[PDB]
Design a protein around this ligand. Structure first.
Ligand SMILES: *[C@]1(C(=O)N[C@H](C(=O)N[C@@H](C)C(=O)O)[C@@H](C)CC)O[C@@H]1C(=O)OCC
Length: 251
């Protein structure tokens, strides 16, 4: 394996790999990390570009994935993809795809032009219909996964998985000091625990001798390093290597 790897550069024909979404005032990171990586993998393994609907995942999976805006289980999300499939759907108010995200973007622990996020957000309804004007039908717009698996808490295996099959979804414990991240390799040193957080790992590297994972957060682009962040790699820091999940698209 190379010392560094950036899925954005390795798969130039898959722009979803470079995009950063906004989960809004809803604890739907479990769903976002999943649909983002799935969007990447659909492009990687069928090179078609599709913005997989975070809305479809968040609202229609149900108990199998957890509790909607109240948090969920990443591996459960990839299972839904293989069982029920996922329709397309872009950013809030984009009118892109079958089911665009219905929760407004907001400021995540930063100041900006958008309204500040409010932890309190309800899970939208599971509507099995597409926005007006979009074709095909909800059922016909479903994209299915053909496998859903968990990658071992092993740095090399995780790197190999990414290197070969594309970005994966992961999760780690968020402490308050992470909220103010701007640059460099994040290492937890202080702050009360905020809870678990699911994200998308799309690569790795070494900064000033410090090995790290290249991660895409779902708190919009004005948070962190243009929406991305780097976190210590190799020591299961904050459990970043403990809950890696992925899957492969059908044909
Ligand atoms: C993942 C999650 O979404 N976490 C919360 C979050 O992202 N909040 C946004 C609105 C923000 O700007 O902080 C929050 C706890 C993180 C600080 O609870 C879900 C989940 O399913 O976690 C399990 C992996």
């Amino acid at each position: 394996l190379p010392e560094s790897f950036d899925a954005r550069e390795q798969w130039p024909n898959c722009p979803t790999i470079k995009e950063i979404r906004d989960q809004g005032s809803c604890g739907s990171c479990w769903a976002f990390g999943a649909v983002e990586a799935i969007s990447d993998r659909i492009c990687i393994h069928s090179n078609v570009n599709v913005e997989v609907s975070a809305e479809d995942m968040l609202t229609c999976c149900g108990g199998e994935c957890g509790d909607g805006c109240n948090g969920g289980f990443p591996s459960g999300a990839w299972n839904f993809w293989t069982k029920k499939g996922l329709v397309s759907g872009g950013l809030y108010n984009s009118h892109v795809g079958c089911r665009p995200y219905s929760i407004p973007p907001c400021e995540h622990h930063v100041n900006g032009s958008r309204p500040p996020c409010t932890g309190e957000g309800d899970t939208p309804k599971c509507s099995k219909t597409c926005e007006p004007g979009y074709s095909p039908s909800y059922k016909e717009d479903k994209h299915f996964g053909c496998s859903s698996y968990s990658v071992a808490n092993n740095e090399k295996e995780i790197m190999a998985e990414i290197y070969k099959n594309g970005p994966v979804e992961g999760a780690f414990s968020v402490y308050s000091d992470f909220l103010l991240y701007k640059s460099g390799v994040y290492q937890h040193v202080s702050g009360e625990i905020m809870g678990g957080h699911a994200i998308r790992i799309l690569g790795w590297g070494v900064e000033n001798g410090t090995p790290y994972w290249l991660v895409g957060n779902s708190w919009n682009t004005d948070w962190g390093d243009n929406g991305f962040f780097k976190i210590l790699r190799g020591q299961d820091h904050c459990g970043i290597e403990s809950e890696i999940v992925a899957g492969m698209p059908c044909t």
